[PDB]
Design a protein around this ligand. Structure first.
Ligand SMILES: [Zn+2]
Ligand SMILES: [Zn+2]
Ligand SMILES: [Zn+2]
Lengths: 49, 146, 46, 350, 48, 101, 48, 33, 67, 335
């Protein structure tokens, strides 16, 4: 029963967060070129590597 | 993936990559997409390919590795109890790479009442097969049931 | 025999005229199969 | 429903892993797990208000006494015939509709009611097949009816779901030959060979008893029972084996077919009943180059049957965004699906 | 890699623009024809 | 003699005997698991082992990496010529006992 | 993390082509006696 | 060398879409809830 | 359907002995395990198919054309 | 290690051949011959026509296992392959039934044929000595003699059970006089190819070619060819008394046996035993008995499909592997 809810969870969790890009200032910004954050997580370091 | 053509009919991936897909085998189905335009290819294998995406996005944690048979089989070679011999070892250190490679056999673990090579070696050479393979590691860890 | 096809229950050799009837000449029973073709056919056992 | 397969439990190959079985050539070829399949194609013949009957006439046969290969497989009647191999694009029943069928019947005719549009049903499939039996009959309302049924016997090809009837659900891996895989002393070769890992994580020991009960059965020559809260008490099974030479528990030695030296650990095998399932692969494999498109959206149609094409869902589509690929989308949701040139007008855009 | 069955390799094709490096493959790769695997099926001339 | 049975792999050889990798088309474990048993006991030979690249393809890769002194190919030549003599003996002693029975 | 992927995946390739071909040629299996309790854990099983 | 090299390499590489990876990251899979 | 003509593992021909089996059981009433043994199958995978394998072909011949 | 494999309760031990110069400090036991010839031996147990069981001593596992593999495949044989139906009405599939003839063995000696060639189709494929054609046709009619109703479905009918016996032989040019002394007969004559009831008839002639084992099991000349590795039971202490009597019931009957209560249980013989390792589960026997099998000594038994005498089978199986090795020698290494 619940996994059918989880899918909707991810899908909608995207739509607000869907386009958020890291520009070349290391300032992650919106579609409309607003600014949600200045550095990345106070860090600037990609969590992956 | 770089595609390779074989007979019968079914999509054969390498077991190590089952975990990202959480691929169970059993009866599950896949989808095979070729790209078309010349620049979508170089977009795929180079960026979206396996090797560079070997890790996971969220945890920066390896998501592709040995699972099931590969662990235990490796374990049974790693089992401190085990030993081997230059014929048996030689053939293992071969089988590990179907051919193709120049192996430099390190000194055997024990000498006298015959000769033997401990599993930690036949598995060690897996990492540094040649003397020219530019892989030098070092590390400590804890497996479970420590 | 060599002629065309068969009843179901009658199991009788029946040749039919072009657009004649779907009945079997002997029995009133209707459905009819088509008897085996005399022509050769090839399998490979393996 | 099933085959009763003499089956080791071992890791072999390296084509095994999760639930994936590994079968045996020279066994599968000896009549293990062979399938047939039967399909029916009904073609109803119906008269039209013009008083014109849809006719099965056929067999063109150009160039000196032989039908065109596209035709062939019929015989003089124009209907298909029994027992003859039919192959891909041929015609197993020739059918033609009248051309004027829907016109307004008038009390005016002399010569031609006879113009026919031949629209025979074509066989299409990845394999050959055979026409075993055809049926000409009449429906309840007195309109002609023709029904043929086609058959093919599928060899249990790589990629075919098997079960253990016990909850193990798996697909065969490499089909090894004969020589390979263990044998031991009798000379017998385990037929199915099965991955051990499945038992502990699925935690099902019922089967792993069923194997014992099996080997004990075939020795005494008796079907040996088992049942929910009951069945043959395991501890006597031992006694039946141990005097007849097989280990008091199901395990026994084996010799790896490859090397030919004793397997360094014991192995556990006996008869188990492996039933073979639907989801034969030769049905389910699917591919498309560029196929038909639905009139409305002009993007590929759905599923098997009709023709190819597959789904990229918004659940999936997002994936490539994370990787950051623009060009893969523009190839994907643009070039490869519906590529289209619209002529617009800069001024007052439409 | 993904091993792919040749029987979906016959019908699932990739476009190629033959230029200067590809000929002695491709001018050969046609002569195989679509039935045998290492070959081509559709062809499109520069004359559009 | 048809020139496709053995093909010396250009990629795994080094120089001056020592290493080499021969792929033997149209074969299986039936040969290798024997041939290596003769090879390994040749006094010089060090590393001799075989594998099948993939079963749906038919090839036998075999690897010979020896000391200095004699040569990669010379090893397999010799040892193979030895595996001859075994079977010659098995026939000799065998068909002799079966005749006397 | 050290040498970049092309070497990593190379290792794992060798892993696979080793553990696979070796594990059968040595062998491993389960059996009933392996799940069979022997004396002992019956005695502790009842009392505990 | 090693340390600060692994540092300078481990950084946002500009142009990556951190939003998408962000969502697909949280995606799977007395009394209080 | 019909008893197979070899087992699925050994390759000893079982096609023959099915007749001699059943005959040997009905006439000369004798227990299964002892029966098959002196019928000459020691290996058990050779043996199952005699023991196993209901014979359908009879139950399929009720439906023949002629009746 | 003294060519005696370890047997334990939870495992085996000491498997690998380990005869080769170069695993020791002092490298001996290096190849040559004579060191081999004057060592190696062979024995035999029994030879029947369609089966032989004999013994092969003091060679390693490998080349023996080669003989097993190559034997169960590479010694060629001849079995019906292509099948031509002249109609058929049988309730059995017009599909399957063909498969059946494909499998049934045949008593004919190979070397009387030559390999079919792939190319040159049709009339140039199957030629004279290249193929043994087999003919079968049977029709079933209601037996005019009908002793009683619903009795045994044999008396009721004619030939309702078709047997492999039914397959006849059709010779051709040069084909008659060459097999005149050795007419082909379908192996074990009595097999059920089909059951059918009157009004039903089967007419087929099937071409029979010379095939090779690994391609389909129906070409295996051998039903079962394998080798049991000789067990060695060896005891410590007299272990005499009453429980020594229990000791023999622990094994399969012949095995060891009691000489006298004081004379305990001597080992009567090995090779009757299945290596069933019960003495280990009984505990108290533990310290005083260990089990072993010797890698040198191969009990080796070979069935036959009836194709030819198994002495011939095992024999040719060698000269294959030999001939193969030499054919590899004389092919020069391309670069
Ligand atoms: Zn009738
Ligand atoms: Zn405008
Ligand atoms: Zn059997």
């Amino acid at each position: 029963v619940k996994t059918a809810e989880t899918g909707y969870m991810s899908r909608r969790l995207m739509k607000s967060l869907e386009d958020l890009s890291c520009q070349y200032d290391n300032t992650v910004r919106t579609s409309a070129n607003g600014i949600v954050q200045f550095t990345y997580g106070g860090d600037g370091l990609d969590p992956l590597e | 993936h770089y595609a390779k053509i074989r007979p019968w009919r079914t999509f054969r991936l390498n077991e190590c990559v089952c975990t990202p897909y959480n691929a169970d085998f059993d009866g599950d189905e896949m989808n095979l997409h070729v790209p078309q335009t010349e620049e979508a290819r170089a977009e795929a294998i180079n960026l979206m390919g396996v090797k560079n995406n070997l890790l996971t996005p969220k945890s920066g944690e390896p998501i592709i590795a040995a699972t099931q048979d590969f662990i235990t089989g490796s374990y049974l070679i790693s089992h401190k109890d085990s030993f081997y011999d230059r014929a048996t070892l030689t053939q293992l250190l071969s089988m590990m790479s179907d051919g193709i490679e120049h192996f430099d056999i390190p000194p055997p673990a024990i000498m006298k009442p015959y000769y033997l090579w401990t599993g930690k070696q036949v598995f060690s050479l897996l990492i540094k097969p040649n003397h020219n393979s530019p892989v030098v590691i070092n590390l400590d860890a804890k497996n479970k049931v420590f | 025999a060599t002629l065309k096809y068969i009843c179901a229950e009658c199991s009788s050799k029946l040749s039919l005229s072009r657009t004649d009837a779907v009945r079997c000449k002997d029995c009133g029973h209707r459905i009819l199969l088509k008897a085996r073709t005399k022509r050769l056919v090839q399998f490979e056992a393996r | 429903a099933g085959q009763n397969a003499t089956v080791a439990v071992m890791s072999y190959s390296g084509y095994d892993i999760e639930d994936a079985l590994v079968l045996n050539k020279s066994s599968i070829d000896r009549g293990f797990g062979r399938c047939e399949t039967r399909r029916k194609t009904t073609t109803v013949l119906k008269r039209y208000a013009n008083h014109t009957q849809d006719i099965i006439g056929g067999m063109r046969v150009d160039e000196n006494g032989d039908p065109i290969w596209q035709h062939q497989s019929l015989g003089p009647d124009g209907l298909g015939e029994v027992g003859m191999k039919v192959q891909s694009g041929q015609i197993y029943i020739n059918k033609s509709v009248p051309t004027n069928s829907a016109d307004a019947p008038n009390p005016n005719n002399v010569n031609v009611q006879t113009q026919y549009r031949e629209a025979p049903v074509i066989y299409r499939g990845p394999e050959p097949s055979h026409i075993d039996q055809v049926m000409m009959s009449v429906s309840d309302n007195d309109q002609a009816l023709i029904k043929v049924l086609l058959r093919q016997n599928r060899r249990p090809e790589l990629g075919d779901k098997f079960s253990s009837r016990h909850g193990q659900k798996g697909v065969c891996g490499i089909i090894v030959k004969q020589e390979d895989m263990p044998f031991n002393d009798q000379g017998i070769v385990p037929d199915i060979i099965m991955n051990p890992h499945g038992f502990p994580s699925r935690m099902t020991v019922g089967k792993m008893i069923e194997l014992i009960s099996g080997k004990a059965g075939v020795l005494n020559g008796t079907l040996e029972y088992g049942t929910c809260f009951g069945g043959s008490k395991l501890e006597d099974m031992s006694k039946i084996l141990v005097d007849q030479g097989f280990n008091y528990s199901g395990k026994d030695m084996l010799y790896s077919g490859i090397t030919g030296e004793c397997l360094q650990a014991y192995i556990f095998f006996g008869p188990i009943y492996y039933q073979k399932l639907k989801h034969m692969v030769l049905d389910k494999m699917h591919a498309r180059a560029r196929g038909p498109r639905a009139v409305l959206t002009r993007q590929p149609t759905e599923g098997r049957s009709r023709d190819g094409g597959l789904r990229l869902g918004e659940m999936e589509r997002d994936c490539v965004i994370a990787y950051g690929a623009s060009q893969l989308l523009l190839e994907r949701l643009m070039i490869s699906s519906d590529a289209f040139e619209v002529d617009v007008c800069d001024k007052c855009g439409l | 890699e993904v091993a792919v069955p040749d029987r979906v390799a016959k019908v699932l094709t990739y476009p190629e623009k033959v230029t200067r490096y590809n000929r002695h493959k491709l001018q050969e790769l046609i002569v195989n024809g679509p039935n045998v695997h290492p070959g081509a099926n559709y062809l499109l001339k520069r004359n559009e | 003699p048809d020139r496709e049975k053995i093909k010396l792999l250009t990629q795994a050889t080094s120089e001056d005997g020592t290493s080499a990798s021969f792929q033997i088309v149209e074969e299986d474990h039936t040969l290798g698991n024997a041939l290596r048993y003769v090879i390994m006991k040749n006094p010089d030979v060090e590393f001799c082992g075989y594998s099948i690249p993939h079963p749906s393809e038919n090839l036998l890769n075999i690897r010979i990496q020896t000391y200095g002194e004699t040569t990669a190919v010379d090893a397999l030549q010799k040892g193979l010529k030895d595996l001859m003599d075994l079977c010659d003996v098995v026939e000799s002693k065998f068909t002799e006992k079966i005749k006397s029975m | 993390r050290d040498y970049g992927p092309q070497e990593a995946a190379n290792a794992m390739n060798r892993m696979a082509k080793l553990c696979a071909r070796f594990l059968g040629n040595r062998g491993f299996s389960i059996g009933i006696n392996d799940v069979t309790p022997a004396d002992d854990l019956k005695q502790k099983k009842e009392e505990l | 060398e090693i340390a600060l090299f692994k540092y300078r390499k481990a950084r946002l590489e500009p142009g990556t879409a951190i939003g998408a990876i962000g969502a697909q990251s949280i995606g799977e899979p007395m009394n209080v809830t | 359907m019909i008893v197979p003509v070899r087992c699925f593992s050994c390759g000893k021909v079982v096609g023959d002995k099915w007749e001699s089996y059943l005959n040997l059981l009905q006439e000369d009433e004798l227990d299964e395990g002892t029966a098959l043994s002196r019928l000459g199958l020691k290996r058990y995978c050779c043996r199952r198919m005699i023991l196993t394998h209901v014979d359908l072909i009879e139950k399929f011949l009720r439906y023949n054309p002629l009746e | 290690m003294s060519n005696i494999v370890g047997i334990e309760y939870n495992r085996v031990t000491n498997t690998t051949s380990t005869d080769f110069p170069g695993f020791s400090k002092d490298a001996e036991n290096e190849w040559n011959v004579e060191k081999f010839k004057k060592d190696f031996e062979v024995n035999i147990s029994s030879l029947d026509a369609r089966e032989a069981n004999f013994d092969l001593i003091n060679i390693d596992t490998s080349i023996a296992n080669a003989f097993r593999r190559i034997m169960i495949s590479e010694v060629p044989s001849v079995a019906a392959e292509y099948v031509y139906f002249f109609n058929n009405t049988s309730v059995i599939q017009d599909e399957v039934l063909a498969h059946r003839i494909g499998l049934v063995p045949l008593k004919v000696d190979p070397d009387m044929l030559t390999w079919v060639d792939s190319n040159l189709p049709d009339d140039e494929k199957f030629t004279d000595e290249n193929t043994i054609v087999l003919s079968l046709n049977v029709k079933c009619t209601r037996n005019p003699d009908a002793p009683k109703g619903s009795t045994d479905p044999k008396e009721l009918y004619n030939n309702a059970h078709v047997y492999a016996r039914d397959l006849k032989f059709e010779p051709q040019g040069r084909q008659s006089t060459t097999f005149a002394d050795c007419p082909v007969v379908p192996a074990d004559p009595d097999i059920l190819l089909a059951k059918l009831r009157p009004g039903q008839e089967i007419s087929l002639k099937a071409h029979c070619i010379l095939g090779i084992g690994g391609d389909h099991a129906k070409f295996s000349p051998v039903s079962t060819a394998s080798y049991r590795l000789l067990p060695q039971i060896n005891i410590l202490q007299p272990i005499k008394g009453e429980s020594a009597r229990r000791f023999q019931k622990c094994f399969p009957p012949g095995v060891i046996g009691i000489d006298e209560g004081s004379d305990e249980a001597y080992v009567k013989d090995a090779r009757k035993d299945t290596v069933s390792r019960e003495v280990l589960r009984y505990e108290e026997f533990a310290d005083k008995v260990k089990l072993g099998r010797v890698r040198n000594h191969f009990i080796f038994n070979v069935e036959s499909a009836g194709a030819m005498t198994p002495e011939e089978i095992f024999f040719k199986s060698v000269r294959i592997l030999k001939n193969k090795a030499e054919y590899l020698k004389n092919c020069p290494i391309t670069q």
